[PDB]
């Protein structure tokens, strides 16, 4: 079992936090919020670094480029914005979604961004030019998550329509539709580190690890609460192999990936834990909560 203990509480977003992500170089935590702001924080000391501003409405997601130099954010203002973190400059505004942009991610090479929107599409963007390369008719409901696989050749998307779909980055073809019994809304999805699996949250208080090629669910994680929000989930791999997720009961849940047993529950937030992230090299978790809390927390374990 891990022994994550609270080290720092980070405050100053003035509305609900929506997402936290560690920079791939491990130096920084980025946060996004309904307050229309991005904030940067020191990953090891929790020290506030800077605020990045420009969206006209709240932000639902933020993501780092592979070299830790750029961010992309997804906003209710129907745009995504690419940011140079060190200068704070908005390099590009990605326009084309027709409704709230909810999720986003760079590909590993970081020349591309993928986004998902309440307009039910997935879009693939050129980072350098800011242009939308493709618009995928991905879902019949809002798109809750988009993620590239390890070599960027595939995209997984999830939607309240109950589907998780796999897309060929190059062609835009749907290569797979994963069916979950009773089609509960899918609130989060992401590839496993090896790209062979997808971790999917559904709004029935359940997380599942799927061999998506075989359409086989390998693991199921429960005990937490998730029926209303798109809570992120992670693979913790720096120490023990765990699954990490926020919960609507204000806790962070940690499970043994193989045994599916809850190994830890982190107490301290006062509202829904919407987002968790795992540091790339140290056993450190960042968590963030909604409007009644507005804090980000950094926790560390010796294993």
């Amino acid at each position: 079992k891990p022994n994550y203990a609270l080290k720092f509480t980070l405050a100053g977003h003035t509305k609900a936090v929506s997402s936290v992500k560690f920079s791939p170089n491990g130096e920084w935590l980025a946060s996004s919020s309904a307050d229309k702001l991005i904030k940067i924080w020191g990953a090891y000391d929790g020290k506030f670094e800077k605020t990045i501003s420009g969206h006209k409405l709240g932000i639902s997601d933020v993501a780092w480029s592979s070299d830790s130099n750029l961010l992309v954010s997804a906003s209710d203002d129907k745009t995504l914005k690419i940011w140079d973190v060190s200068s704070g400059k908005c390099l590009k505004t990605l326009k084309g979604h027709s409704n709230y942009v909810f999720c986003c991610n760079f590909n590993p090479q970081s020349n591309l961004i993928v986004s998902g929107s309440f307009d039910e599409s997935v879009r693939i963007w050129d980072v350098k030019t800011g242009k939308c390369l493709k618009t995928l008719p991905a879902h019949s409901d809002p798109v809750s998550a988009v993620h590239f696989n390890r070599d960027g050749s595939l995209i997984v998307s999830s939607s309240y329509d109950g589907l998780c779909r796999i897309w060929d980055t190059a062609s835009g073809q749907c290569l797979k539709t994963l069916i979950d019994d009773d089609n509960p809304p899918v609130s989060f999805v992401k590839f496993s580190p090896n790209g062979k699996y997808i971790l999917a949250a559904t709004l029935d208080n359940t997380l599942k690890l799927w061999d998506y090629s075989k359409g086989k669910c390998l693991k199921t994680y429960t005990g937490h609460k998730n029926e209303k929000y798109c809570i992120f989930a992670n693979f913790s791999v720096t120490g023990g192999k765990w699954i990490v997720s926020g919960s609507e009961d204000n806790l962070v849940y940690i499970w043994n990936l193989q045994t599916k047993e809850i190994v830890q529950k982190l107490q301290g937030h006062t509202d829904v834990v919407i987002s968790t992230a795992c540091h790339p090299t140290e056993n450190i978790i960042a968590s963030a909560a909604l409007e009644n809390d507005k804090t980000i927390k950094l926790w560390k374990s010796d294993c």
Binding site: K15, A16, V17, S18, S19, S33, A34, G58, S60, D61, D76, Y100, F102, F118, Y160, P185, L203, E227, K228, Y229, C230, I274, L290, E291
Partner: peptide, 8 residues
Amino acid sequence: MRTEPRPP
């Protein structure tokens, strides 16, 4: 919008 609930 991620910060707002989806009525089940």
